[PDB]
């Protein structure tokens, strides 16, 4: 069946501390607070220019109060994990040592 979700319009919450993997990647667990779910999670790893990449192919939220694990590879050093669109978009500062 033709899998098509609109980009999430509402706000997202970080559920647990960002966890680092042994293969130089990070797992960001988030939940959706807005409407229109199931929807595609807007996700980008940028500077304060795209710097990092997404591992979880098509990150989607099924419903409200249902956390989703997003695996992503941030670049070495400084980066900003941007989850969702404005207003009140989630911007997480990350530093990979």
């Amino acid at each position, epitope marked *: 069946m033709g899998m098509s979700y609109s980009m999430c319009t*509402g*706000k997202f*919450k*970080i*559920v*647990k501390e*960002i966890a680092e993997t042994q293969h130089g990647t990070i797992v960001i*667990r988030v*939940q959706y*607070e*807005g409407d229109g779910s199931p929807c595609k999670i807007p996700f980008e790893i940028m500077d304060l220019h795209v710097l990092g990449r997404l591992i979880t192919v098509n990150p989607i939220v099924t419903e*409200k*109060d*249902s*956390p989703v694990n997003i695996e992503a590879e941030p670049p070495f050093g400084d980066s*900003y*994990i941007i989850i969702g669109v404005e207003p*009140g978009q*989630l*911007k*997480l*500062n*990350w530093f990979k040592k």
Partner: single-chain antibody, 229 residues
Framework: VKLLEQSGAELVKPGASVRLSCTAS????????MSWVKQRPEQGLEWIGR????????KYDPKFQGKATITADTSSNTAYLHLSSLTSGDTAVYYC?????????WGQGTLVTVSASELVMTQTPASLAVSLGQRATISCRAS??????????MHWYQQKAGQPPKLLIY???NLESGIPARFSGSGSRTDFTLTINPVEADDVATYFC?????????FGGGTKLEIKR
């Protein structure tokens, strides 16, 4: 249907121990952190500690060390609070609460009746008298930073009598879903404010600020919002 259901009221003799349960339905406990909160009659909220039910990692406020033990059973989707050698000081309503960016879901509370270099969260004013339709500002000053990933983990709650707290604001300025636009938050670093504009009759309650960036996830002393007489 998303809900946290706690075990019934407990009558404990002084010196005895007790274990309270918190059963989740509609969601999995392993999804986020589960905290336990103590509230003595007519007093403020006291964060005991938190559990990550996925790996069983526990963190406590120093005040509850040698008193509280938080556990979880993922198969039964239940979190637990063990309290040892009870005294009248342990007589309170104990709440279980889900989440990191503010506690959106709370249990109904469990009454426990006993019968025979630290982080400071300064909430001002302790009491606020306001007329119907007025602007009300509640301040919260933390002794340490409340930042994590460049975000201020400052949350605000509304608590009415005989009811668990209700999350209003999370991440210092974000309005919780379902909460009216009259509630707003602002601030950064250590200084934070909650604004209720205009104050309605339903707004008569006790308000609490809370940090969650790092353990302890300390609540402010509270602000009792009343109507001007």
């Amino acid at each position: 249907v998303k809900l946290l259901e706690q075990s019934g009221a407990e009558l404990v003799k002084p010196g005895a121990s007790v274990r309270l349960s918190c059963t989740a339905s509609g969601f999995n406990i392993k999804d986020t952190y589960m905290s336990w909160v103590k509230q003595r009659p007519e007093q403020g909220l006291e964060w005991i500690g938190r559990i990550d039910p996925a790996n069983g990692d526990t963190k406590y406020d120093p005040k509850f060390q040698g008193k509280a033990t938080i556990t979880a059973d993922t198969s039964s989707n239940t979190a637990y609070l063990h309290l040892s050698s009870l005294t009248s000081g342990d007589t309170a309503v104990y709440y279980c609460s889900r989440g990191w960016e503010g506690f959106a879901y709370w249990g109904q509370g469990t009454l426990v009746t006993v019968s025979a270099s630290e982080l400071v969260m300064t909430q001002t004013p302790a009491s606020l008298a306001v007329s119907l339709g007025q602007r009300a500002t509640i301040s919260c000053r933390a002794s340490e930073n409340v930042d994590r990933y460049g975000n201020s983990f400052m949350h605000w709650y509304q608590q009415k009598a005989g009811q668990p707290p209700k999350l209003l604001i999370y991440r210092a300025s974000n309005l919780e879903s379902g909460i009216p636009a009259r509630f707003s938050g602002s601030g950064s670093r250590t200084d934070f404010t909650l604004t209720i504009n205009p104050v309605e009759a339903d707004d008569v309650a006790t308000y609490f600020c809370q940090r969650s960036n790092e353990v302890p996830w300390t609540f402010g002393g509270g602000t009792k919002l009343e109507i001007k007489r």
